[PDB]
Amino acid sequence: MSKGTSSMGKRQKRTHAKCRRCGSVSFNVHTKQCTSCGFGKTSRMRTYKWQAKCKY
Amino acid sequence: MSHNMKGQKKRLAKAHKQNTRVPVWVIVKTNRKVVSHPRRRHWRRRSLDVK
Amino acid sequence: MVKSFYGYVRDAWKNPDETYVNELRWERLQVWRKQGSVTRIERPTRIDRARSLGYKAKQGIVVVRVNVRRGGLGHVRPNRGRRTQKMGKNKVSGGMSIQRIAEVRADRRYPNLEVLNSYWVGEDGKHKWFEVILVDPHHPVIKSDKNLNWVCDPSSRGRATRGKTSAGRKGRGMATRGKGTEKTRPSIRAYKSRGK
Amino acid sequence: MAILRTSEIRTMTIEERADELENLNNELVRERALTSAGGAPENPGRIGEIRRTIARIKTIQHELNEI
RNA sequence: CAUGGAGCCAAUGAACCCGGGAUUUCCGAAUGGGACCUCUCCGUAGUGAUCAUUCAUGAUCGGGAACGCUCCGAAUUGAAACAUCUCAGUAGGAGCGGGAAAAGAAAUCAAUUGAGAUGCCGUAAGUAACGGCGAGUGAAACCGGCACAGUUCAAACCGAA
Ligand SMILES: [Mg+2]
Ligand SMILES: [Mg+2]
Ligand SMILES: [Mg+2]
Ligand SMILES: [Mg+2]
Ligand SMILES: [Mg+2]
Ligand SMILES: [Mg+2]
Ligand SMILES: [Mg+2]
Ligand SMILES: [Mg+2]
Ligand SMILES: [Zn+2]
């Protein structure tokens, strides 16, 4: 259908479930990883230095 | 009908219990300084992301 | 000359290509190729070198043959736009030697021990072999020891992955003193890595 | 004072302590059952006093190796 | 938090504060198996993976505001364009790790003849040096301070002491 409100009626599925380790709704049900804390990918918790300004 | 497991139903029950008017005696004791909480919603509005 | 047999072993390994050691190389290389990346061997292949580097016959001391490829740092062509000086990567060998790679793999395989030293033991057209000496710090024999109890300290964890071994200090540019070491001591990071 | 002090709990015998524990549990069950029907309790301090007393008794048993 | 009703607790010393114990659901390094199922399956009540020994037992795993060590590593920008150069070993990434870490007792620096481990601060100095010798980049030693500390193996001799 149209790219606007006509194709937004098929919006009945879900792509992210709820994570066990952090409780945030960011668990990818296809790749089986949490996109916020990294659960499923690793035993460590996801942190990147680009999640904040260079502190200078 | 959205067949749920135990945990999903548990979280749904909690989110149901949070829709409550603040008790009248709380409003009396705090001298009309507490009249609402940020957990109030309505079922036909923004969907909750509990599940 | 009244000489120990360690001296004779040292002489024999002084020039491998011109002694009986070449035939032993021919036999040993096949058995070594059949084996895996990291292998525990009961006795060191070269006794004199091990004793020189701090090897003793006691519990809690382990020796291992590691296996590492030859060549430089295998590097990928950049996907996006560089500036024609950073675009080339085929002739850019690494900045880390092969002994360091060997010791780091050995450390990764043995999570409870700690690396002490290593030495060269052979090589062919595809591979190089080193032996790494590992010491267990939580064994009572090591704890009672007076020449090895320094390893039961809270500054010796991860001793190989922070460049504290001998090859690590060679690679950090701190094998000497004086001219040329202006920007390599007391560390590479202290001078914004302009040394090395 | 309280439903029981620590001195009486430590002084009693093992069966005496257990019996006091069952009596307290039964009274708590009755008190909760009455209050569950939307009624003002006849004495709404009983529940707190009872639960704290049962906590005392269980602590004393666990300390004396009883359970 | 948060002086409303009705109750209870407290001189058997409460409330409160300092120190020490107990209970401590499920997930989580998560570790008997399994997770678009924070629960579920067999219950054989459960040492998950990798390691060391005398094979009794023991070690590692995750977190921590910044600081620390090792390795990999851009472009916008400046040069009034731009390619060496600069931005810059910066931003970013991987590994390891403590209350600090790294270094550390000369195969050193000097100059005619001397000094005597290391680190940090001051100065040397925008100097020597590099560079479409353009724009720019850029030290160390001598000297003055803070604080001071030196030692252990391999081998020659004895051969289980
Ligand atoms: Mg579109
Ligand atoms: Mg930063
Ligand atoms: Mg491997
Ligand atoms: Mg140190
Ligand atoms: Mg320009
Ligand atoms: Mg750690
Ligand atoms: Mg050193
Ligand atoms: Mg530069
Ligand atoms: Zn998560």
Swiss-Prot record, chain A:
Cofactor: Zn(2+)
Annotated SUPFAM superfamilies: Zn-binding ribosomal proteins
Assigned keywords, A-Z: Metal-binding, Ribonucleoprotein, Ribosomal protein, RNA-binding, rRNA-binding, Zinc, Zinc-finger
Cofactor binding note of this UniProt entry: Binds 1 zinc ion per subunit.
Top-level taxon of origin: Archaea
PROSITE patterns: RIBOSOMAL_L37E (PS01077)
The keyword RNA-binding is annotated on this UniProt entry: yes
GO-annotated molecular function: rRNA binding; structural constituent of ribosome; zinc ion binding
Binding site for Zn(2+): 19, 22, 34, 37
GO cellular component: ribonucleoprotein complex; ribosome
GO biological process terms, semicolon-separated: translation
Residue runs in coiled coils: none
Similarity remark: Belongs to the eukaryotic ribosomal protein eL37 family.
The protein's name: Large ribosomal subunit protein eL37
Taxonomic source organism: Methanosarcina acetivorans (strain ATCC 35395 / DSM 2834 / JCM 12185 / C2A)
Curated annotation (Swiss-Prot), chain B:
Keyword Ribosomal protein set for record: yes
GO biological process: translation
Any one of the GO CC terms: cytosolic large ribosomal subunit
Pfam family, one: Ribosomal_L39
Stored SUPFAM superfamilies: Ribosomal protein L39e
Example of a GO MF term: structural constituent of ribosome
Gene3D superfamilies the record matches: Ribosomal protein L39e (1.10.1620.10)
Keywords tagged on the record: Ribonucleoprotein, Ribosomal protein
Superkingdom of origin: Archaea
Transmembrane segments: none
PROSITE patterns: RIBOSOMAL_L39E
Family, similarity comment: Belongs to the eukaryotic ribosomal protein eL39 family.
Protein name: Large ribosomal subunit protein eL39
Swiss-Prot record, chain C:
Region (Disordered): 153-196
GO MF annotation terms: RNA binding; structural constituent of ribosome
Gene3D superfamilies reported in the protein's UniProt record: Ribosomal protein l15e
GO BP annotation list: cytoplasmic translation
Biased composition (Basic residues): 159-172
Coiled coil (UniProt feature): none
Family annotation (PROSITE patterns): RIBOSOMAL_L15E
Ribosomal protein among keywords: yes
Keywords of the record: Ribonucleoprotein, Ribosomal protein
GO cellular component: cytosolic large ribosomal subunit
UniProt xrefs under PANTHER family: LARGE RIBOSOMAL SUBUNIT PROTEIN EL15, RIBOSOMAL PROTEIN L15
Similarity comment: family membership: Belongs to the eukaryotic ribosomal protein eL15 family.
Protein name: Large ribosomal subunit protein eL15
Organismal lineage: Archaea, Methanobacteriati, Methanobacteriota, Stenosarchaea group, Methanomicrobia
Curated annotation (Swiss-Prot), chain D:
GO terms for MF: structural constituent of ribosome
Domain of life: Archaea
Any single GO CC term annotated in Swiss-Prot or TrEMBL for this entry: ribosome
Matches recorded under InterPro entries: Ribosomal_uL29, Ribosomal_uL29_CS, Ribosomal_uL29_sf
Pfam families per record: Ribosomal_L29
GO BP field: translation
PROSITE patterns in UniProt: RIBOSOMAL_L29 (PS00579)
Keywords: Ribonucleoprotein, Ribosomal protein
HAMAP family for the chain: Ribosomal_uL29
Family according to the record: Belongs to the universal ribosomal protein uL29 family.
Record's protein name: Large ribosomal subunit protein uL29
Species the sequence originates in: Methanosarcina acetivorans (strain ATCC 35395 / DSM 2834 / JCM 12185 / C2A)
